[PDB]
């Protein structure tokens, strides 16, 4: 029971990483709805270099490879008013992203599925009581509109949407 | 010293697209984001979203997500606001804003505006 | 998300004498507040950024002031020129703003 990622160029089994964080923006504007949507940053390097829990792989929207937090879930944010900044995910377990060669990149549905729920769980402590919503990126150039990353000196390109797109009540 | 110049008022008719255009210069385009907001007329200002020109991220207000695109072209230090389905309450002046510098101040304290655009919903 | 609440909607004031504008934030923004003054066919002009910083080339009759919830904007002495509509702004949230006229 798998999400299964297509990815270009075709990623090699050896490109398999452990998904540690990752990077959001959240939404703006006002809703009449309760709810707080999230979608994969809106920024760029400078945000992701932030979060200081990259390791030595090169990667958008997924820190791939990187540190874990001790216990549980943390998030982070310069100013969680502030839709500009962008909003840090350290992950306690990992999930790993096993890679056929083949063409795409598979994740665990479930093991996805619960770790988007500790995240939203983390968000509500931050935002209040609400419905939480994962959704696509909004755009951007294609290193940063798709999760990529560098390996080997190859840069591969996973469509994410899969991954951000569910709600959390 | 720092510009931000708006392309000119149009016309455009009930479901029909209109694209503003918004170039600045006199500083690093890369380093702030552009925000858009307009106001309706007599009427108060209402944020749109922003587009980050570095990367192309944008952040756009929720009521017009699926109706709005923002691009932009580094080449010319250009950004570009697209909004789509035209009703008559989108008539308005839209107005490109830029911040100061988005790393450590707020990204949200508009030193610079365009002159704006009057975009007028109509058959 | 973040609510404003801007007062009065609208002001006459003789030439000279001192103007209040009021600011109530739905929740703690901290220092996070600016002030625009927008004269009519004009863009908004940043007057006060981060809730008491004049913008550079501002004169100085201008001021804010507060924190957490509850913010101020004042003029001093109310030059002719002055007449527009003030706004305040958290984040993208604009208050609804305050027409300053001139009474003579």
């Known amino acids: 029971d798998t999400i299964t990622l297509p990815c270009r160029p075709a990623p090699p089994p050896h490109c398999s990483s452990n998904i540690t964080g990752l990077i959001l923006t959240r939404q703006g504007g006002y809703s009449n709805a309760n709810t707080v949507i999230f979608r994969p940053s809106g920024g760029d390097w400078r945000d992701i270099a932030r979060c200081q829990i990259a390791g030595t792989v090169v990667s958008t929207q997924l820190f791939l490879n990187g540190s874990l937090a001790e216990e549980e879930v943390v998030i982070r944010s310069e100013d969680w008013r502030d839709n500009a900044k962008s909003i840090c995910v350290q992950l306690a377990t990992s999930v790993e992203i096993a890679c056929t060669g083949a063409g795409h990149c598979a994740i665990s549905r479930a093991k996805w599925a619960n770790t988007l729920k500790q995240i939203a769980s983390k968000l509500r402590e931050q935002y209040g009581a609400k419905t939480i919503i994962f959704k696509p990126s909004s755009g951007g150039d294609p290193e940063f509109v798709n999760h990529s990353f560098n390996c080997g000196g190859e840069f591969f390109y996973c469509a994410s949407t899969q991954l951000f797109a569910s709600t959390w009540f | 010293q720092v510009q931000v110049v708006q392309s000119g008022a149009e016309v455009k008719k009930p479901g029909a697209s209109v694209k503003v255009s918004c170039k600045a210069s006199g500083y690093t385009f890369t380093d702030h984001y552009i925000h858009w907001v307009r106001q309706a007329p007599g009427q108060g200002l209402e944020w749109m979203g922003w587009?980050?020109?570095?990367?192309?991220?944008?952040n756009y207000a929720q009521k017009f997500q699926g109706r709005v695109t923002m691009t932009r072209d580094t080449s010319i230090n250009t950004a570009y606001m697209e909004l789509s389905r035209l009703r008559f309450d989108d008539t308005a002046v839209y107005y490109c804003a830029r911040p100061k510098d988005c790393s450590g101040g707020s990204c949200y304290d508009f030193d610079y505006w365009g002159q704006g655009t009057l975009v007028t919903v109509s058959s | 998300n973040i609510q404003m609440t801007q007062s009065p909607s609208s002001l006459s004031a003789s030439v000279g004498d001192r103007v209040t504008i009021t600011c109530q934030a739905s929740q703690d923004i901290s220092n996070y507040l600016n002030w625009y003054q927008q004269k009519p066919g004009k863009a908004p002009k940043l007057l006060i950024y981060?809730?008491?910083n004049l913008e550079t080339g501002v004169p100085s009759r201008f001021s804010g002031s507060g924190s957490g919830t509850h913010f101020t904007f004042t003029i001093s002495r109310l030059q002719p020129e002055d007449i527009a509509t003030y706004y305040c702004?958290?984040?993208?949230?604009f208050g609804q703003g305050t027409k300053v006229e001139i009474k003579r």
């Open positions: 587009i980050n020109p570095y990367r192309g991220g944008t």
């Open positions: 702004q958290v984040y993208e949230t």
């Open positions: 981060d809730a008491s």
